[PDB]
């Protein structure tokens, strides 16, 4: 049986203000500028449609050199950080961004016709934009996050899959890394290997995988390291109505409409697909620059950052606004020439995470290192190599941010003003 | 008309969030009968279809609306939880 | 696929092998013509999705049905008369759920009946 | 089902001369939806298979020559050979393309005097 860390973590009384001083990210919005020849990255994709995930490294407790050391016994127990206030501050103005692609699988409008549409010829695409479903969400765990999307499934060994054969589909598992993409507005799925067409969504999710949380597994989750605590926010509506030029992949059963004749002989394309649209952005409705006080978890685990770790979440596309920069190639003729300027595009990303930590200690008795050592074996090797080495994330260092003076701190001024004592 | 059902939202939501049965305006006051229990539900705040295509070759650098089948998926995802208190009934 | 000679209340299977294009994005018309007599439609198949129209007529006589891998279309004409001798063509009308002309015909089976 | 007439059934012209022949159709093959008229002239020579010289009412596959010219629209169609050929010893088809299922027309045999 599993049980709440309130049973076996003891409560100090001391606390430690910890920030980042003031994360930054620039880059391009839609993709990543490298050299053609060469694969090493000159600009990066950054982008406010993107998942935010921060490793957040803790000094170990043990290590660290408080001024007192009376408060607990070294030799039978140890000591744990808990994350007890957090403010993730962000910094930019609020607005919204918006992607398209120049060669979008977009046929004919179908949201009104007053004529039957002509003919898909060959490669009838369009160059269309989008404001994307507009989403705000923090995940906070000792766990990285977890998301799922759709991808391609396993075939059964039977018929063998006859080319252009719709794939089979999987909702997939996977852990959810600094840099990936959140669902658009075209759900959670991976475009790169359920869309060889490569233009059924704008470029910067066209090639990527939209991962959404996975909340209920997450939450399932017996000790419930991965998120003891959430805030989510997401809305979307139906701007536009479109078809999909292509080939009949899988026909209308006649038995669901009549035969039509010389236009409505043949039947348009049924594939129909909607464009996405966050509406407006608001202050109020803003989930961040505000602190969580993160009292009472819902999960058994309250908080307890074991390893010295902690994951925070985040993903904000209420300040997506993406910045077109462009530069003259000649600074001379006192006319416009579409010619003589280079146009680019940026957008920027402000972050400033804060927290707000609580000493804790754990008697190493026999049931209890017996049960953490089941929950996770690797707290008591560490206590008296990076296991996730192979995903990566926003790696961010706190062991010199500690302060003993919440005082000196606005998360901190805040803290001791909500916990009066 | 034409509906048109407008944005949805999260603050709207209606599950993903515990309902206690404790008083029922019926006389019924959730009781099982039969050892059943029916649970009716639609959303359509996650109605997202999603379209897949497959090339019929993977040569030709040009496209050709001819040498890509679409198709349309569309996936839903339930968990189903409960509390149930045992009683009896003195016959 | 070469002459046929069946007898009345057999059945027959013909062949039409395809080639030069990207077989499964065009559709294949079926047509019969006996002797001295014009064309008649059998009907129509897709091969990239198994999609089959039939005349009316030869509903019950012919069977369409394609193979992928070999880019072959077949027609198996079943309860044979001497109504069913005549040369049978296979043909291709161009890519699409339109309904366009007949672009190219194989060079024709002959079937007797007798 | 659209029925379609064609005449004459049989035609003799000398080198040179104009050839004139009309094919109809039960109902219009008209399709506002491109502003097209679904109709395919085809030629088959003695022995061969039937092979495609107009579609679309008017408009001449490529190789055709140009003597061979498609007009017509609605239910009147014709086919002129400007002047004819001995090589266009043949019999013509007209057949429509406008919804199912598709009919012949009955077919003109061009003869050639000398």
């Known amino acids: 049986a599993v049980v709440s860390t309130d049973e076996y973590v003891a409560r100090t009384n001391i606390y430690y203000h910890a920030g980042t001083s003031r994360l930054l990210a620039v880059g391009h919005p839609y993709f990543p500028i490298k050299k053609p020849n060469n694969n090493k990255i000159l600009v990066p994709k950054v982008s406010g449609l993107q998942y935010r995930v921060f490793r957040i490294h803790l000094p170990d407790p043990n290590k660290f050199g408080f001024p007192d050391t009376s408060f607990y016994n070294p030799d039978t127990q140890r000591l744990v950080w808990a994350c007890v206030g957090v403010e993730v501050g962000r910094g930019q103005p609020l607005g919204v961004g918006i992607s398209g692609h120049p060669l979008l699988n977009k046929l004919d409008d179908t949201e009104n016709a007053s004529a039957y549409a002509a003919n898909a010829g060959v490669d009838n695409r369009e160059c269309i934009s989008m404001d994307y479903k507009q989403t705000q969400l923090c995940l906070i765990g000792c766990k990285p996050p977890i998301g799922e999307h759709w991808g391609k499934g396993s075939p059964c060994t039977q018929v063998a899959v006859q080319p252009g054969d719709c794939p089979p589909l999987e909702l997939i598992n996977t852990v959810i890394q600094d840099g990936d993409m959140v669902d658009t507005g075209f759900g959670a799925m991976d475009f790169t290997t359920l869309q060889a067409n490569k233009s059924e969504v704008p470029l910067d999710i066209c090639t990527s995988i939209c991962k959404y949380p996975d909340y209920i597994k997450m939450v399932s989750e017996p000790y419930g390291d991965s998120l003891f605590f959430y805030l989510r926010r997401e809305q979307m509506f139906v701007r536009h109505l479109f078809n999909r030029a292509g080939t009949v992949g899988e026909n209308v059963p006649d038995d669901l409409y009549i035969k039509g004749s010389g236009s409505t002989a043949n039947l348009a394309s049924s594939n129909y697909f909607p464009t996405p649209s966050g509406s407006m952005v608001t202050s109020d409705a803003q989930i961040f620059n505000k602190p969580y006080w993160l009292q009472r978890a819902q999960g058994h685990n309250n908080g307890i950052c074991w390893g010295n770790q902690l994951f925070v979440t985040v993903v904000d596309t209420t300040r997506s606004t993406n910045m077109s920069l462009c530069a003259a190639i000649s600074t001379s003729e006192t006319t416009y020439k579409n010619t003589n300027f280079k146009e680019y595009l940026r957008h920027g990303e402000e972050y400033d995470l804060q927290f707000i930590f609580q000493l804790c200690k754990i008697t190493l008795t026999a049931d209890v290192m017996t049960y953490i050592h089941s929950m996770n074996s690797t707290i008591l090797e560490d206590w008296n190599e990076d296991p996730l080495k192979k995903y990566t994330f926003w790696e961010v260092n706190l062991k010199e941010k500690f302060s003993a003076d919440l005082d000196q701190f606005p998360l901190g001024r805040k803290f001791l003003l909500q916990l009066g004592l | 008309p034409t509906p048109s059902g407008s944005m949805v939202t999260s603050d709207a939501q209606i599950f993903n969030k515990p309902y206690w049965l404790q008083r029922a305006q019926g006389h019924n006051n959730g009781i099982c009968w039969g050892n059943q229990l029916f649970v009716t539900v639609v959303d359509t705040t996650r109605s997202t279809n999603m379209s897949l295509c497959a090339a019929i070759s993977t040569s030709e650098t040009t496209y050709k609306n001819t040498n890509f089948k679409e198709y349309l998926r569309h996936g839903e995802e339930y968990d189903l939880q409960f509390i149930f208190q045992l009683c009896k009934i003195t016959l | 696929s070469g002459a046929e000679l069946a007898r009345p209340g057999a059945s027959v299977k013909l062949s039409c092998k395809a080639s030069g294009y990207t077989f499964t994005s065009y559709w294949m018309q079926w047509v019969k013509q006996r002797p001295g007599q014009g064309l008649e439609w059998i009907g129509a198949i897709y091969p990239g999705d198994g999609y089959t129209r039939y005349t009316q007529k030869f509903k019950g006589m012919a069977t369409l049905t394609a193979d992928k891998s070999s880019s072959t279309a077949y027609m198996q004409l079943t309860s044979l008369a001497s109504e069913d001798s005549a040369v049978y063509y296979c043909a291709r009308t161009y890519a699409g759920y339109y309904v366009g002309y007949f672009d190219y015909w194989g060079q024709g089976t002959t079937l007797t009946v007798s | 089902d659209i029925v379609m007439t064609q005449s004459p059934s049989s035609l003799a012209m000398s080198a040179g001369q104009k050839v004139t022949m009309s094919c109809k159709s039960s109902q219009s093959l008209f399709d506002s939806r491109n502003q097209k008229n679904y109709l395919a002239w085809y030629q088959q020579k003695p022995g061969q298979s039937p092979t495609l010289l107009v579609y679309?009412?008017?408009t001449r596959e490529s190789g055709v020559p140009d003597r061979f010219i498609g007009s017509g629209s609605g239910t009147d169609f014709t086919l002129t050979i400007s002047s004819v050929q001995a090589e266009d010893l043949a019999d013509y088809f007209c057949?429509?393309?406008?919804?199912?299922?598709?009919?012949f027309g009955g077919g003109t045999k061009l003869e050639i005097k000398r």
């Open positions: 057949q429509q393309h406008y919804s199912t299922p598709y009919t």
């Open positions: 679309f009412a008017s």
